[PDB]
Amino acid sequence: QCQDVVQDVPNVDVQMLELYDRMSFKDIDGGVWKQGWNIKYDPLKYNAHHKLKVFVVPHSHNDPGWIQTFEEYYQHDTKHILSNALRHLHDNPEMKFIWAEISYFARFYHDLGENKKLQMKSIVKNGQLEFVTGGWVMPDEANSHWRNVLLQLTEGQTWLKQFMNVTPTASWAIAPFGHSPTMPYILQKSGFKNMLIQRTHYSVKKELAQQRQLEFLWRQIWDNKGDTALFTHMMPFYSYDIPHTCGPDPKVCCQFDFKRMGSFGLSCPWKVPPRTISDQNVAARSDLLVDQWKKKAELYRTNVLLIPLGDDFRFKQNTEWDVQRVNYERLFEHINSQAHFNVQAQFGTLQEYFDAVHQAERAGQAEFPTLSGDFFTYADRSDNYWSGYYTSRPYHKRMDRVLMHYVRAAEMLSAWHSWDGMARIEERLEQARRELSLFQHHDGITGTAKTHVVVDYEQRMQEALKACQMVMQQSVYRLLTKPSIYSPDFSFSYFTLDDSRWPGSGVEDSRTTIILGEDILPSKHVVMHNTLPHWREQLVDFYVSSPFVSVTDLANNPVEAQVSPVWSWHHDTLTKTIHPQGSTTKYRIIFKARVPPMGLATYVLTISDSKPEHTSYASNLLLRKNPTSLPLGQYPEDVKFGDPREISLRVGNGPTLAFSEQGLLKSIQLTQDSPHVPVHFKFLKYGVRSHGDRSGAYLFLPNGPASPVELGQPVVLVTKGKLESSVSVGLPSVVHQTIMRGGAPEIRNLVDIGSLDNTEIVMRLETHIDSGDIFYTDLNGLQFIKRRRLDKLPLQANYYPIPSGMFIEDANTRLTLLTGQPLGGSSLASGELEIMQDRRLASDDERGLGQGVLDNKPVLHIYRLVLEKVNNCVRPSKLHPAGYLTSAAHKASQSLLDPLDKFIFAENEWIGAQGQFGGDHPSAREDLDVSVMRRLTKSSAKTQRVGYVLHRTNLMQCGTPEEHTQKLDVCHLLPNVARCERTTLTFLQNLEHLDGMVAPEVCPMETAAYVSSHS
């Protein structure tokens, strides 16, 4: 039944990796079409029985934050655009307009009076104003997680269904910097039939244009059958503005942007202005315009032509609506009445274009090619590759993944119950979803906005995190308190969240210490949540005010624990060293939590007057010349000192790691007998060019290969414990930490680029794996795509997004690096992986931001590093464009993106506390996730509805029997099920009524949505 995603290489007309291997990428001057050629056409192609049908589609690109904040743009620009669109479309029944960004549209519509809301609904209902995509934003496609692309699509489309009674089936993505197949994947599973893209490499546009392959059926790289295919239109020219949308010659097209005559403060760079259309010049003007159109039409297969008419924050002033509409109407009247042109031109919408194209297709006038692959890394000209934004503003890139998980956890924890309106649960969740959705914008997560705009996004995300926390902690109190005792105050904090990795040690002192003492409080309840649908163990840590603390479960069973010091690193501006200081009053307690699928587990921390039986203490070794003492208060083991030296550590039965005298990994030995496999971490720096084009927020233009960071003799701290050991080193700009808990290590970098201008800090792994020119990186946390390093392209072109992981492998060995944040990276030589940590750039890179990147702040980046033998794995053939994780690497990714949540009871005594929730939840196969659980109804609905998105990844078969799990039927997770339906991923359309009210599990690489109804 399920397609095999490993063993069958899809047959497609265009496969982008194969295309890349054969293309030359020469940047030659093509004439007026600078990156193309002089298009020729036969005037006799079109005649009375075969006309060229031209749709001119007015639009206005509205950024939800970029050079101004969302609200600043709304007040200065977008409210006027929407108000004038309402008036002008109402008064001119033939005029049309498309709208993409529902964040703005919702902000506007809710401020309208009823009379105007009704006028607005009427111009939508009658097809004059058409929503395209309908997401909250037009998201970045490189750094965004697929879960958040879905979240923002759903937020916008749910608003549209509710208020406008429409669901777009055509997507418009004119602005993201390069394009991902994650988009057609999600859109096709959300009812879409068509999509449009624009920012692809100029060489790719030229190559596909030559073959008339700019319209294609875009399927996923593993899809043999083609059921994922989505019809895609790629625009052919350098920009989506008017000069680059009428045809190949911008000097001509610019004369048809009637906003550029002077009074609006705009002009044509090509030095020939628009002229008002009159009876005396309409023939000559129409000659010029129709020639452009016929040239553009040569690049496509049907007699239906799309002509976008818009640009950034256009259609603001009434006078602008008039100047565009009246002049185009005069052109249409002339062109359409002159039989010799054999053109019928008119204003249209995006859907009208695609409907006409498919009519031509069904008439047998065209067949379209199939395509798989992606469209990264984008270059718009010369060697200007937009790989800088894979890293820019990495603090907020990390924040995105933290909030991603908090939103999921809050929606899931609160979904189990119906909530009174006074609890404000729906209100807080809507705020959290909207702020996370806003940040998916192609100037949000990308790090390409002005400083004060980044601050705005950060503030919004902080508010969203507080909202998630409130919802989460109220939900835990309800789920774990005896119902007849449960007595909620919906404003009260029953628990506080404890997060060990955000903002992170050295970033913010934000974690509460659990305060215990014989004269204040003997013990404290803590609760862990596991959002994943399988039983999970994970080490968890809390700060406590005594080293003498023991852990129990709620059956009072002792739990083995480890206590370690609290270490903070300081750039000592007196001694000019970076070194750690230990607390003499706060300590870390660490223990293994075991939590049910989608469940909760309670533990108790209790103080005693001396070392407890079931708690051990880590040893600590500070390696440096010229040590001074490090007292640790009551901590029972004295810190040891030594000169820098190589060291080796092993936790449990796990790998043995060896480190250099500078505290950096040099080798990994998987088992007792096995080789010490060379795996070396190194930090390097890229610079900026001193002549020619400068790196900025968008572009990465290095002045050659990276140079090693000079390390000096750094201070190394080794902590050795039964449950957790670590090696931490204070390097220039980076406190680098390797943590061992018995499996693949965790890596944490506290990155503070300080005042190092024009520097990019990279973390590289050096191995002897014979990977050649091949490596793999993920797309949106959804799939791994094969990359080939191309020495015919510059270094920055071989950088790709690393939104969640990357790997290299040979016949026998693979190294996978999983990330807790999207960053840029590559494999620039056989056996290497590298990933950029931060970048600080003094110059603007001429893309409109008008500033460099000088607002850096300390960030804690997190990773897992998985070395594995892969000789026994069933891998795709050499020609397959995909790769797949192993079980260990997938689990390591989940440990970073969706860790256990930790809650500390806030008061002294928790009356009616219970030990566990979800112990009867099915424990699903490891490749299955419940990506979303969301209650879709408020408490006043007679029939309650709960939505689930179920995703199954595909993990490699490597010989592990891995057995007995339970079937997960999401429709039976809540009692009193009356109906189970399969829906689109946005939950907005029912696709199948399910027998037995049973939701089937999905196939590998598939994602399905289900809604259960409850009486």
Ligand SMILES: OC[C@H]1O[C@H](OC[C@H]2O[C@H](OC[C@H]3OC(O)[C@@H](O)[C@@H](O[C@H]4O[C@H](CO)[C@@H](O)[C@H](O)[C@@H]4O)[C@@H]3O)[C@@H](O)[C@@H](O[C@H]3O[C@H](CO)[C@@H](O)[C@H](O)[C@@H]3O)[C@@H]2O)[C@@H](O)[C@@H](O)[C@@H]1O
């Ligand atoms: O590029 C990614 C970006 O795409 C869209 O926005 C693109 C904008 O492109 C054009 O503006 C580029 C110029 O903008 C500035 O204001 C300046 O920063 C300028 O640089 C000069 O000055 C710099 C000072 O630091 C200097 O460093 C540099 O060397 C330059 O000398 C930029 O060159 C425009 O197309 C702009 O659109 C406005 O202007 C149009 C032309 O007049 C109008 O037709 C239009 O209505 C609008 O008023 C674009 O906004 C967005 O998609 C964005 O999301 C994305 O990040």
Ligand SMILES: *[C@@H]1O[C@H](CO)[C@@H](O)[C@H](O)[C@H]1NC(C)=O
């Ligand atoms: C919404 O659209 C449908 C047609 O798609 C129509 O039948 C219905 O009356 C419209 N108004 C609603 C649903 O309120």
Ligand SMILES: [Zn+2]
């Ligand atoms: Zn934009």
